[PDB]
Amino acid sequence: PIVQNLQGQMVHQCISPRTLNAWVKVVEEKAFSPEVIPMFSALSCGATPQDLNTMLNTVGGHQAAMQMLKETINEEAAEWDRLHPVHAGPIAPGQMREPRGSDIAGTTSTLQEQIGWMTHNPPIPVGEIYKRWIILGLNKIVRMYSPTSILDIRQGPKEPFRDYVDRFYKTLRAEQASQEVKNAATETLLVQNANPDCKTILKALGPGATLEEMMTACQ
Amino acid sequence: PIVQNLQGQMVHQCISPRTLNAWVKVVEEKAFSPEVIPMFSALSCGATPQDLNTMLNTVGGHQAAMQMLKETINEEAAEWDRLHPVHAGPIAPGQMREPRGSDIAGTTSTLQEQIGWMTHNPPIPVGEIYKRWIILGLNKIVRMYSPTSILDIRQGPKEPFRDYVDRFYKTLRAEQASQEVKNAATETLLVQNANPDCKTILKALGPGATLEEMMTACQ
Amino acid sequence: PIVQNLQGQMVHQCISPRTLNAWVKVVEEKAFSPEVIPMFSALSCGATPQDLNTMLNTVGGHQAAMQMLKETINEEAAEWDRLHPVHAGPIAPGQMREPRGSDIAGTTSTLQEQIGWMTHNPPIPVGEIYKRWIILGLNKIVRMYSPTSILDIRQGPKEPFRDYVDRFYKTLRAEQASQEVKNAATETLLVQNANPDCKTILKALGPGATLEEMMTACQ
Amino acid sequence: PIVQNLQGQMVHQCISPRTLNAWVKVVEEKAFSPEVIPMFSALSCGATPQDLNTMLNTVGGHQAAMQMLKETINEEAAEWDRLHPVHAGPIAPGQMREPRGSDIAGTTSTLQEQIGWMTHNPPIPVGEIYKRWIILGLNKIVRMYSPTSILDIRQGPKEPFRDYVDRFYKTLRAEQASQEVKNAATETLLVQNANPDCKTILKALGPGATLEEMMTACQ
Amino acid sequence: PIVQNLQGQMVHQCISPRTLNAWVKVVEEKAFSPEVIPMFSALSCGATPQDLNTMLNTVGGHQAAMQMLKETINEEAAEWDRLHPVHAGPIAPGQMREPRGSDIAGTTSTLQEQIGWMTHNPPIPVGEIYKRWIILGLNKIVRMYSPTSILDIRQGPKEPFRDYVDRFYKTLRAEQASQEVKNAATETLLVQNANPDCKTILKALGPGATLEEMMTACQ
Amino acid sequence: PIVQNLQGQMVHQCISPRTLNAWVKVVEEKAFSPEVIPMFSALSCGATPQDLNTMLNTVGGHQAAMQMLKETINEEAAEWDRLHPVHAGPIAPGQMREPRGSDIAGTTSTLQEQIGWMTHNPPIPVGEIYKRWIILGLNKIVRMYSPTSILDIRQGPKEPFRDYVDRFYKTLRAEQASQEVKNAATETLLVQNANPDCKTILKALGPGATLEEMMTACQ
Numbered sequence A, B, C, D, E, F: 001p002i003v004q005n006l007q008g009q010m011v012h013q014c015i016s017p018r019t020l021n022a023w024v025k026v027v028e029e030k031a032f033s034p035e036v037i038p039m040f041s042a043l044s045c046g047a048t049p050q051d052l053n054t055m056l057n058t059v060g061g062h063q064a065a066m067q068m069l070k071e072t073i074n075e076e077a078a079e080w081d082r083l084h085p086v087h088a089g090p091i092a093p094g095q096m097r098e099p100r101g102s103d104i105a106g107t108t109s110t111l112q113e114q115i116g117w118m119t120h121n122p123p124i125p126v127g128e129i130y131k132r133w134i135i136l137g138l139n140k141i142v143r144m145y146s147p148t149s150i151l152d153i154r155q156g157p158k159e160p161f162r163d164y165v166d167r168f169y170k171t172l173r174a175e176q177a178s179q180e181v182k183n184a185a186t187e188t189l190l191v192q193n194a195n196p197d198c199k200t201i202l203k204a205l206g207p208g209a210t211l212e213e214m215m216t217a218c219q
């Protein structure tokens, strides 16, 4: 990653064994549960494109997903190249060349180039641009591997309302509902999918009940 | 987080793998037992709003709770915006803009903005303001998930008085009794809910017995 | 905690995940065995009052003990306030206010105030003053939870003398005997409570035998 | 390794216990699965030739592989020596000598020499040159230990299409297919090797289907 | 401990959680096996008397041993006081007082005093003086808890000579034989205590056989 | 160890708990398998003679080996003393004395002396000299504890050729064959000791087959 040291210059630091192992283990334990994504982003704080490739390449399973991710990265790289074409022909001696999509993705750029871009004044933030593409891909994977429609999350007859609400919003998160819908689903599908006893209680609460109030009501 | 380095300037540092894993594990092991809250506060020492969102987003279960927390944060954000409206229209070139509620919550502000606010002279402590909102929400969650009324904590006939007192104050903590009440419950409900043998001994101690003295008396 | 950095100024540093977890685990594994106290003191090296409260608040069980500790802290705070009353009315602009008992305990003082006191020249050592109160309380707890009188530690007929001596001094430590008594118990109760065979051997050694010599004699 | 310190000079630092153990454990757990290679590269960030030899020598099993790797390194060393012969006869007093293949491999050069080369202006990057040779060898090992031809990866009749795709691309990775082929295999062998039901669905999608679209279609 | 920082002044640093836990665990796992002593010395590198007391006080079992150790420390303290009596009466304002035995042992000296002594020019090395006393005591404990005489280590009839030699020198180490005797025991008791078959082979080797040669001969 | 700090002076640093535990555990788990030696060398990076003795002394088992190692160190010390006799009689005030063998081994030299030698300009590298003696001894131990002759490593009739090659070169490593022999054994003993089926295939390959080619041929 690129870090400020103790004396305020941005320099390269090797990726730590602790970081490498954290990432491999979270993928082993959680697969593509949605909360793996913010974990990736956090563990990749300050990453160069080289570091992001290290993290992705250290994954041993899930090669269908990793191939889908390669496809998404190629699409974003191709769109970058449409927006920001680069001068063909020889670079100015000693000067910084402009990054192409594959340079951002770390496949045709050196670590030194990456460092140069990222520590330029002002920085050409190749690590952050690539990380956005990766996360775009990972979010597709999450949605793909979500095993259950929100329509099929219904409260069982002796299921505690809290355990049902947990299943409901765990499902909405993987299915990738916007916050609008998450905020909104509470006046609607959450009540619809509730068991008959709790449904009666919730119907009687009136509109504009908070989730807290719904949860208390069906406790 | 924002830390002073070895040479006394406040700078950003990535959230550590050790911190990320500590938080995920304490939620996995303890859920919303009350002592998770001071753990959160401690693990979030110096956090930016981005870091606080990382911590909350890395939680995989408990999505009912996390949706209730979103609701509490939205309420606090809305109250901030009432108290501190911001100038609409274009920002002064190169200057610091005033944070809105959603900026404090990290959803409409960049890391750079956050850093700017937090390291301003004097600091606009967006991390500490957001952390207060989060803890307000978490405390509601704790109270919600408290499974037992203090009225139902009674000493069993062969229950050691110490084990009963532990249950009693463990319950009062989750139910969120003030210190007044915790201090006070010792002249009252603690004795009432004691078994007949210990109740007789405690009644005879007189008023103004310390808990230590009550515990010794029923040993 | 407050630490000197690499360049010799005293500054605040966040409490580490390693420290937080060490403390929670030692309480989980050892409860209020006497050796938990020096562990607390060591893990709280350099602590602010905020940090000491973090450590105490992160404890999830033992709430009878934690309520007894609150009582002891309140008593010490009240005695501080007797000895060191503070000027009522407004503080001098920009100047340091004098700490009250509850300020020392971290309940009515900010982290900034604490830092100010602790790094004043000369330091008003609020962390060390509070830590003394806490340890006073913890020592009472240890004594309370000591399950066995020294009178009841007697060597079994086929109990190795070393295993008996271990039980004896493990008991004296929890019961909180002074070093005088620990030094002294060797000419007396240790021999009295020894089995008939070893008692004869020890009686014959004469007075002024070291523990080493007693242990060798009954090997 | 050679690291920049806190003040921006490149200096030698001992290999850490954490690094040493990470590498030994990944070889113990994963053998020569392809993802061990990017792990090696990452754990060897900044390594001297001495450090790379340490890592290879700390491996206890797999001695057939380690002997094959020695053979590959000897071949690369011999090709270096063809391209870059060195002046025989005595070195200039106090001056840097030119590295031979065995110097790059760390077998005839001292740590001091290595440091000298690597921190020269401009650096003679002996660590990076050796690491390339090692990785060339490791890639051969991976290919050797790949147990299954891509021709034999066929979707079972009740095998989820995702689990088949995972096996397929896990195999292609060990067999060391180029990205061209990985990108391409999706219009061809992946469909051919699919079970009859999914094969019909994929045939009907048309050419130019993404893997994402194929995966959705056979869900 | 007292450490040099990054800029070459000797300053105090808190004892680490890793150090505290290492020591507690080695005592839990190994008791007073001889190799615990060099572990203690190493884990106490740079320790103040306060730190050494922390380490000893964090031990929960073995209180017979810890009482024997207190006795040894008191004896060494008393001998220090004989050799180095201190001026009674008031200290020179602002000046360093001379340490008494109990000051060296950390029981009547503050951390500040200790730091003062240890960082004086030239240092009055109270940490190293106390550590020597402690190790003197620990060595007595080791010898006490050694369960087997060297006379009783004899090679069994189907015992591999190497396993017998391991038992032999493991015993000599706990029994605290000098290196002279360890060096010497090889021409004598080691052969005597060997089984009849190996004894014949060793007798025939001649005098002045190395242990290596004896071990090869009885392989 | 002696390390450069953040500002480029060589100073002493305590041996870490992580290093101490790494070494004890590798000896516990691997005994004197050959790969323990490069682990020792790596974990002892920068070590003083004191540190090397710490590492050796922290080993609890294997006392036959540790006594053999003492013998080897004494032999090397005696040869050093032959090559580099020291001036008897009093040292020049304030000046550096010349190290004797036992000084190099850390038994008659202080840490301060060691530091002085190792940080002299130019360094008298006592740590590296002692480490060479130790490794000489450890290599003898490895060879001693090698349980199997290379003559007895033969491919079983249904043993995969790769598993046989692993046994073969694992044996050659412990038996301490030179690289010449390891390189060479491939045209000879490896084929001889192969099972009849693979032997026929290898005989037919011709001379000058690489190990890779032999392994492929018998796959």
Ligand SMILES: O=C1Cc2ccccc2[C@H](c2ccccc2)N1
Binding pocket: A053, A056, A057, A066, A067, A069, A070, A071, A073, A074, A105, A107, D179
């Ligand atoms: O070097 C790498 C490793 C990797 C691993 C998994 C997923 C993507 C990647 C990306 C990459 C590769 C080729 C095309 C697109 C993206 N680059």
Ligand SMILES: O=C1Cc2ccccc2[C@H](c2ccccc2)N1
Binding pocket: A179, B053, B056, B057, B066, B067, B069, B070, B071, B073, B074, B105, B107
């Ligand atoms: O980015 C995040 C993640 C998160 C996770 C759990 C709970 C709250 C949050 C808050 C957030 C989101 C949307 C509305 C309110 C609060 N922001």
Ligand SMILES: O=C1Cc2ccccc2[C@H](c2ccccc2)N1
Binding pocket: B179, C053, C056, C057, C066, C067, C069, C070, C071, C073, C074, C105, C107
């Ligand atoms: O904030 C805290 C947490 C805590 C936890 C356990 C025990 C004592 C404390 C003390 C406290 C609280 C209220 C009265 C006295 C002492 N302060």
Ligand SMILES: O=C1Cc2ccccc2[C@H](c2ccccc2)N1
Binding pocket: D053, D056, D057, D066, D067, D069, D070, D071, D073, D074, D105, D107, F179
């Ligand atoms: O020192 C070493 C250790 C090692 C261990 C495993 C594999 C290769 C190596 C290389 C080495 C050795 C001899 C020839 C070629 C390469 N050097």
Ligand SMILES: O=C1Cc2ccccc2[C@H](c2ccccc2)N1
Binding pocket: C179, E053, E056, E057, E066, E067, E069, E070, E071, E073, E074, E105, E107
């Ligand atoms: O504070 C301590 C703790 C401790 C613990 C175990 C053994 C010795 C010690 C020494 C101590 C105490 C009293 C007399 C002598 C030595 N000091």
Ligand SMILES: O=C1Cc2ccccc2[C@H](c2ccccc2)N1
Binding pocket: E179, F053, F056, F057, F066, F067, F069, F070, F071, F073, F074, F105, F107
């Ligand atoms: O202090 C030590 C500890 C130790 C432990 C195991 C093996 C060798 C050593 C060497 C030592 C001792 C005495 C003679 C020779 C070598 N020195």
